[PDB]
Amino acid sequence: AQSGRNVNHLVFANTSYEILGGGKKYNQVFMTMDGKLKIKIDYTVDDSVVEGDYFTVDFGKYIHPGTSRKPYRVNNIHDANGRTIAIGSYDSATNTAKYTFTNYVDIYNNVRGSFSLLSWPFKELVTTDKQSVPVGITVAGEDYTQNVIFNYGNRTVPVISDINYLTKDFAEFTTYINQNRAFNTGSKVRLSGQGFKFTSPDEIEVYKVLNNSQFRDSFSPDYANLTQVRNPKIIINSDGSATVDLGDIGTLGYIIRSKPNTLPDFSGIGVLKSEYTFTNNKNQRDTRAHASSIQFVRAELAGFGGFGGYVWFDKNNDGVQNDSNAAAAGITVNLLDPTGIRLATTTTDITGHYNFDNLTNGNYLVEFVMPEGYIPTQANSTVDDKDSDVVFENGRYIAHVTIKDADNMTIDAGLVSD
C-alpha cells in the first residue's frame, strides 16, 4: 500500500449545503419523498502534497455519506477529463471519509476544484418530524455547521411504513400499526413485495408499543426498549408475501420490523406494501394500506468489490501455469484508472499472490512492474485460470479488470527473461 500523511493542513476546503427534493421550498429534507442533503466542497491543495497523502471529511454526529444503502461509501474525486485526483474511502467507526491523493498531485500543480456528496441523517438520532439539528462536519480540517430540518411525514393513522435501510441481500422495512391508538380487534397485516420476497418467519419481528413517543417519526425504532412478541403468528405465503396475525390488539400500538430479501436480477422500483385489516371501534371491518418504494439494481447494490492474482516465472515459456518453484515474490502491482493515474499499489507476497480489496465498482488497469531483464510471457495462451493476462498496451504492461459487486476475479502475470 501507498504510504502518506494526513495533509488536512495543506488542503483548504470551503463547504456549503443544499437541500434536495420536495421539501427544498420549505427548507426541509423530505426523507420519505426524494429528500437528501447535498454537501458541496470547493478545495485547494498545496503543491507540497504528494501521492499517498490524504485529507479527511468527518461527518460528525448527525449525518453519514450516502442514503439508503449500507454500508455507506464515498466516490473518488475526478477532474474534468475523468482523471482521479483522490480515491475515496469511508470508515463507519469514525464516521470519516479519507481522500487519498493519487499521483495526480505529482503531475499537476496548483491542484484545486470542487466535488459533492449526498448525505442522510442517522435515523436513531434525527428521530422527529421538523426537528432541526446542527449538522456540523469537518472538511479537510475546516469546520462547517448549519442547522438542517428533517421531515419523514409520519402520520397518526392505522398503517404507515418506510424503508429504514437497504443492503445487497435484504432491506429493513418498518411498519407502524395503530399509531392512532384506536380500539382494534381481529388485526392482521399482509406484507407484499416487488423486488423483495420473504422466505421465513424469522425475517419478521413484532413489537408492542405502549407509549407513542416510541413511534419514532424516522421509522428506525429503539427496539432494545420495546417488548418483542417473541412467538408471533406469522405465515409465509407461497408467493413470498407474509401475513402477521396480531390478534385483538385493543388500543395498543404495534411495530413490525421486516427483512425481506432482495430478488436476484431485480432492476427497478422495489416496493413493500403493508396492508392492515382489522375491526375498528365501530365494530366494522376495515382495510388500509401503505406502500414504500425504493429504486435499486441488485447486481450493483453493494457498489464495490475486489480482485487479486498471482505472478510467476513461466520457466518453460508456454504462457501456462505449469511451472514448479516459480512463484514471483516482491513484484510491484499498480492499480490504475483508465486515464493511467495510479490509484493504489501493492507487492506480491512470498506465495506469489497480491490483491486489492474494497474497490468501488468500475473499470481499472492492472500494471505489473517487471524485474530487471524480464517481460511478460505470451498472453491468453490457455484457459483463463491458467494463463497470463498481461499485454503491452498503450506503453504499459497491463491487464484490464472490471469490478462489479464481486471479489472473485483474478488477474495473473507470467514472466520470462528478455
Query: Which residues make up the interface to K ion (CB under 5 A)?
Result: 8, 105, 140-141, 314, 316, 318, 320, 322-323, 380, 384, 387, 389
Bridge partners, residue 58, by sequence: 96, 138
Residue the block writes with cell 505529482: 106
Shortest gap between Cβ of 144 and K ion (angstroms)?
11
Judged by phi (left if over 0) then psi (alpha if -120 to 50, else beta), residue 168 lies in alpha
Tally Cβ neighbours within 10 Å of residue 147.
11
Shortest gap between Cβ of 194 and K ion (angstroms)?
39
Nearest position to K ion, beta carbon: 141
Tally Cβ neighbours within 10 Å of residue 169.
11
CA separation for the pair 334, 52 (Å, rounded): 13
- The smaller minimum CB distance to K ion, of residues 236 and 311, is found at 311
- The smaller minimum CB distance to K ion, of residues 200 and 339, is found at 339
- The smaller minimum CB distance to K ion, of residues 173 and 313, is found at 313
At 398, list the grid cell: 497491463
Shortest gap between Cβ of 49 and K ion (angstroms)?
5
When computed from its CA atoms, the radius of gyration of the chain, rounded to whole angstroms, is 27
Amino acid at 240: G
Tally Cβ neighbours within 10 Å of residue 159.
24
CA separation for the pair 190, 98 (Å, rounded): 44
Which one-letter DSSP state was computed for residue 69? B
- The smaller minimum CB distance to K ion, of residues 4 and 232, is found at 4
- The answer to whether the CB of 380 falls within 8 A of the CB of 371 is no
Tally Cβ neighbours within 10 Å of residue 285.
9
- The smaller minimum CB distance to K ion, of residues 157 and 320, is found at 320
The DSSP H or E segment spanning 343 is: strand 342-347
Shortest gap between Cβ of 50 and K ion (angstroms)?
5
Shortest gap between Cβ of 417 and K ion (angstroms)?
13
- The smaller minimum CB distance to K ion, of residues 140 and 366, is found at 140
Both ends of the chain: CA-CA distance in Å?
A: 28
Sign of CA dihedral 222, 224, 225, 228: positive
- The smaller minimum CB distance to K ion, of residues 138 and 258, is found at 138
- The smaller minimum CB distance to K ion, of residues 46 and 300, is found at 46
Residue the block writes with cell 479527511: 56
Shortest gap between Cβ of 66 and K ion (angstroms)?
24
Shortest gap between Cβ of 310 and K ion (angstroms)?
9
Shortest gap between Cβ of 76 and K ion (angstroms)?
18
